Scaffold this active site. Sequence first.
Site, PDB file in Angstrom:
ATOM      1  N   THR A 179       0.814  -1.208   0.000  1.00 49.12           N
ATOM      2  CA  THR A 179       0.000   0.000   0.000  1.00 49.12           C
ATOM      3  C   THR A 179       0.851   1.265   0.000  1.00 49.12           C
ATOM      4  O   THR A 179       0.405   2.314   0.480  1.00 49.12           O
ATOM      5  CB  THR A 179      -0.951   0.002   1.196  1.00 49.12           C
ATOM      6  OG1 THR A 179      -0.193  -0.033   2.413  1.00 49.12           O
ATOM      7  CG2 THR A 179      -1.875  -1.205   1.141  1.00 49.12           C
ATOM      8  N   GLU A 254      31.912 -19.272  -4.139  1.00 51.88           N
ATOM      9  CA  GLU A 254      31.507 -20.043  -5.308  1.00 51.88           C
ATOM     10  C   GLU A 254      30.214 -19.539  -5.933  1.00 51.88           C
ATOM     11  O   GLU A 254      29.915 -19.912  -7.073  1.00 51.88           O
ATOM     12  CB  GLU A 254      31.365 -21.518  -4.927  1.00 51.88           C
ATOM     13  CG  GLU A 254      31.857 -22.478  -5.995  1.00 51.88           C
ATOM     14  CD  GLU A 254      32.167 -23.853  -5.441  1.00 51.88           C
ATOM     15  OE1 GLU A 254      32.058 -24.036  -4.210  1.00 51.88           O
ATOM     16  OE2 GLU A 254      32.526 -24.747  -6.237  1.00 51.88           O
TER      17      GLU A 254
END
Lengths: 438, 425, 352, 54
Positions: A179, A254
């Site tokens: 909202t 990684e």
Amino acid sequence: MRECISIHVGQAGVQIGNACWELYCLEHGIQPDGQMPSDKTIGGGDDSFNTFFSETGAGKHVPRAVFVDLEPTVIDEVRTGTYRQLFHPEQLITGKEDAANNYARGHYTIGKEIIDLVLDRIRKLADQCTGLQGFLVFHSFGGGTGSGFTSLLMERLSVDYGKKSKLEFSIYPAPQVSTAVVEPYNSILTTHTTLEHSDCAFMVDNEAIYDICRRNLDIERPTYTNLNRLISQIVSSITASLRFDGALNVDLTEFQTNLVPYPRIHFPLATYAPVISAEKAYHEQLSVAEITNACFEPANQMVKCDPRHGKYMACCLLYRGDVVPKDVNAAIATIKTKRSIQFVDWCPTGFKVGINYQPPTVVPGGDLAKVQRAVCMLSNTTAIAEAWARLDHKFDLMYAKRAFVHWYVGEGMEEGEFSEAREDMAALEKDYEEVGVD
Amino acid sequence: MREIVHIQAGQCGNQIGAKFWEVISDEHGIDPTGSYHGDSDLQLERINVYYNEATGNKYVPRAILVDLEPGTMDSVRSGPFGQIFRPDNFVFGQSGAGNNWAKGHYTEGAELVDSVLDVVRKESESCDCLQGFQLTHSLGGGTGSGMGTLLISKIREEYPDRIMNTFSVMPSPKVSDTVVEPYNATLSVHQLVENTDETYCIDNEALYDICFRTLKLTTPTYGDLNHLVSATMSGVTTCLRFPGQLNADLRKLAVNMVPFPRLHFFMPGFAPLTSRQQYRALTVPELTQQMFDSKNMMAACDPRHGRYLTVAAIFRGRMSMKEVDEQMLNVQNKNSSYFVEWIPNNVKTAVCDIPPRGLKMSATFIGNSTAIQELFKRISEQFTAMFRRKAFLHWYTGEGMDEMEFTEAESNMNDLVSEYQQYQD
Amino acid sequence: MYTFVVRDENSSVYAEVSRLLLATGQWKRLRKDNPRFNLMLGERNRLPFGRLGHEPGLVQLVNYYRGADKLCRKASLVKLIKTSPELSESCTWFPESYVIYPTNLTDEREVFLAAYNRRREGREGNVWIAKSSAGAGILISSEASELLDFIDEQGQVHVIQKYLEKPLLLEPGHRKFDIRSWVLVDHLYNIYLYREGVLRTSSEPYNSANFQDKTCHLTNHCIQKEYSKNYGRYEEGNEMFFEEFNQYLMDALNTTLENSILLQIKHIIRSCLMCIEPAISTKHLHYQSFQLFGFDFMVDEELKVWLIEVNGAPACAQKLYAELCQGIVDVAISSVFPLAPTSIFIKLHHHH
Amino acid sequence: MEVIELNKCTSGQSFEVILKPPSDPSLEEIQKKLEAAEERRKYQEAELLKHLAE
Ligand SMILES: Nc1nc2c(ncn2[C@@H]2O[C@H](COP(=O)(O)OP(=O)(O)OP(=O)(O)O)[C@@H](O)[C@H]2O)c(=O)[nH]1
Ligand SMILES: Nc1ncnc2c1ncn2[C@@H]1O[C@H](COP(=O)(O)OP(=O)(O)CP(=O)(O)O)[C@@H](O)[C@H]1O
Ligand SMILES: Nc1nc2c(ncn2[C@@H]2O[C@H](COP(=O)(O)OP(=O)(O)O)[C@@H](O)[C@H]2O)c(=O)[nH]1
Ligand SMILES: CC1=NN(c2ccccc2)C(=O)C1
Ligand SMILES: CC1=NN(c2ccccc2)C(=O)C1
Ligand SMILES: [Ca+2]
Ligand SMILES: [Ca+2]
Ligand SMILES: [Ca+2]
Ligand SMILES: [Mg+2]
Ligand SMILES: [Mg+2]
Ligand SMILES: [Mg+2]
């Protein structure tokens, strides 16, 4: 073993993280009071789950996380919920009045008076780590805190933990469950100040999670509980490689090594399946070629867009459950001959596959049904650029009239930081187009 | 605990705020003695926003009743919920304001303002984390208008970072107490443009035409009008009084609703407005057509003449939050030529499970429309009609005002209309 | 009350559809930049596809398929055919074409010279035509040196394909012509062929010994109306509709438009669209797509149908605007946004 | 279709499948922006108090 600290900033960040650590305790068999009967090593040990949890002399498995919010209502839920005995008060930090969806209030005005406190608490956790990998930062783009205080925290984390990695789980704003109106401003402001400090961010669109709650779970009006339980399911699939044994995505380094070739383009796309409704009478279990084949349907994307008109730079498949490598390859071969998967010419056309035999744990009394095999695909696509365009267009339509710029300017911020950040986004969209289009 | 300090000043400000506390005290389940007797925990969830907790589990409204004469407050103390208020929060004089903005702002009101600000400090110090101040009053009288604006000018000086909302009743010759109402309004409107974050405009003609025409009330009275404002005030404060996904404070709401610092004048609406066919359950499409109907708005402005910057609708009662998203997203996509296409997603909707006393469901409408300039145009016309002849100025010049200050209030309001105008095209 | 937007003021086809929608009284047009809409009549180039399907409670439909230019670009099509297995390089209904980039910028210059040298080596016809998407710019010549040189004098992608030296000729007149079919693809990917078609003929007798006077070779409606001298002699506006043409095929050749040509046109259309379906479909997408095409065909003296190009933004015939546009609303729009026959289309079933 | 780097363990396994080959601000500077902002709030709030003073 190397530890991983979690940081939740704002209501979205806090609630989401709270559902995550619920799912973690169920996936690792950790009771609400912190006890882990399966853990035979009492008081210590360097197991794969210890990267997220620590151990006291009394056998309490405590997470390596921090909850930060400028208003106490949302964090008091954690201080008194089912999993209240897990965290100790140090890890829960609360202000008194929030940033009123204002970024300038979360970065400058209010955040300035609490920034040192959060770092001191994050420090205490790092003091327990023998080898800190980095931090995972959960936050919303829309909130004044998740957008404002997060960027300031990120800027500082790069100063005190230079060589450490920092991943993001960002809630992208969707007007269907929000909202607020000044969300496009916060998003472009938080992304400009956090770009150079984040090594990899996973965007979740409340609009995407919302539809999956209505189309698959048959929920007419999805709540934050429904949305969070689903979001944590994806958070789990993306962080299980750090909490279990294996060789794919074993440490935060990684994630960039495998998913991020270029520095500024560090926004993968997440696709998850299956998503079955528990209220269903009973579902026929999908094959490995079916859930894998579903990783290319937009309906199961954490951000709505069309990868058929983009180029791939990386692609990971994180399976969980009854999945054998033979079936993955076959399903992959069948998907290439039918799908349009265009990689960049300066990157091999390949997939990194990880398999975890433990099927996805489902929260008792939750919305999702228990499935025998689920998969979550991560792929760096130039199609995800669609999300920045929509958000930039809204920024322009408002900024062209200076609408709401006084609330931000009234907290000390300069109007130049609006066009200064907007100019940066204009460059980000310029980089995606250099790599995907011809 | 995000506390709100309520101030009601003047005859109107007190009579309306009196019914206001009488309305929300009923929703939260608090009898005229401060004792809770509800059956739901949602009533006490955010109860400390308007009520302080006294000894014996007593709940005392955090209000400060202000007036320069004793009459209006003698009736409050002895009226329905008179005892609920704090006996010390009654700050009043004996001379009165004589429906004169100068007597409330410069002379009589200035003599009493200090003692009021001392009471405000007692309620503020004990606030764990103050949200802001909300003031109820009229803009066409003396005390509420005159002293009310002064009380706002001195609250921002001592609290420059707190939010300030006002429920300002605009005067109307159709429901007029005195002929000097245009003057008293024009002077306050500039004070509100400067030191208020949010002003709800409540025109008496609209309130009167809403009672006469819609409610089929032959002979409206001030009380009947105050019933509407009571239902409306309750409606707009639902987000701040009850829990749910919608967690909001006054600043959080003001940030999303006010795109420009001076255009913070909201025109509210309510539904249903049924006459005594009154028990017929009103369908969702029926609440949304009236709530967006000019006849159901309380600013006496035709929205189709202006353009909406932001619009908020709050529904109450056990209904379909799915159908709600449908009917709202219907009126938008059917009358979009009245929304500015440079504020994405300016129309928003909330749902509350607790309905007002005796209603299956209701709907409040909080609009920030450039059409509100029609309200400031009528005032400026009635002002110029008199000021050009310097009529009735002696009531003011005798109190210490100069004619220059009147010419300024005029020009300041004419600029306001110009600022609203450039945004309408 | 449905809502739509008009972002292409030059589209004569969708200027008529926009008029019909407003005529029904249940559609309301908005500013070309208003986001709350159900149907978008977007622009040709750079249509913001990325912003569709994101307005809450709004089902949105656009009059274009994202990625359909693969079929509507000169070079893009020759590449799609040769690289797409559904068409293969040995495509039978597409004239042997080659993508040729100018020497000032892959390039099929060598592959073309290998085929050009074997035709001249067997006493075969060798008349090629050069053309590019950057034309109003065409060169017909039996010399490979003039073609490649005419392309070097340009600065965009050109395509050199075999020029049909034996096209079917109408009578009387001994004149060339082409066929324009209009295909409408809805959101469900149902391929609708307009029962009506137009033949854009040449009012000049075909001369196989002169490719310089490009009037008797290029049947474009804009080249006959400017360089030709027999415009409007045989048929009005060099437009022969399926009624008279089908009436000619029965008198002169003893066959029917359906069997000798329409069966192939109904086949080439299915092939081009089903091929790119896995790429442009909007089945499971957040928004919906639909688009009208314009398939241009050649017909040789052996009653074989060839595919020249596929227009993405095709205009319609003056006598078929009303009927075709009304059909666009019935099948393409009203099917998505219903209102409160005997179809003018020939649906081409297929396996999705 | 080439499978490389196949790592197997007790709770899963990982590998790569290749289909086709290839064709900051310091702490001094962050204190200035925060204090520079803290000064424009002091400035604006000062004007407000000087305006209310008049
Ligand atoms: N998916 C999901 N989104 C949420 C949740 N909670 C809030 N949001 C979204 O977050 C945005 C609002 O920002 P918040 O994070 O709640 O605000 P904040 O971080 O507390 O910052 P301040 O309110 O200014 O103090 C809206 O777009 C919401 O839709 C949640 O639990 N799950
Ligand atoms: N390989 C070929 N063999 C015979 N004629 C050919 C040909 N290629 C083009 N033409 C002639 O050229 C005309 C088509 O030209 P082309 O389509 O390349 O230009 P254009 O696209 O601007 C016209 P359109 O409006 O149909 O798109 C046809 O009328 C046809 O007679
Ligand atoms: N709706 C409503 N309006 C009122 C009421 N009393 C006064 N007014 C309006 O307020 C104006 C007079 O202000 P007043 O209440 O006398 O202010 P005061 O002098 O400070 O007491 C008139 O224009 C009236 O229209 C009331 O009880 N209800
Ligand atoms: C009192 C107030 N209520 N509100 C408000 C605004 C929108 C919806 C609901 C409530 C304010 O901004 C100040
Ligand atoms: C109910 C609410 N409506 N709103 C709102 C905000 C901006 C535009 C429209 C509406 C709130 O903040 C709470
Ligand atoms: Ca252990
Ligand atoms: Ca770094
Ligand atoms: Ca006195
Ligand atoms: Mg918040
Ligand atoms: Mg009075
Ligand atoms: Mg063309």
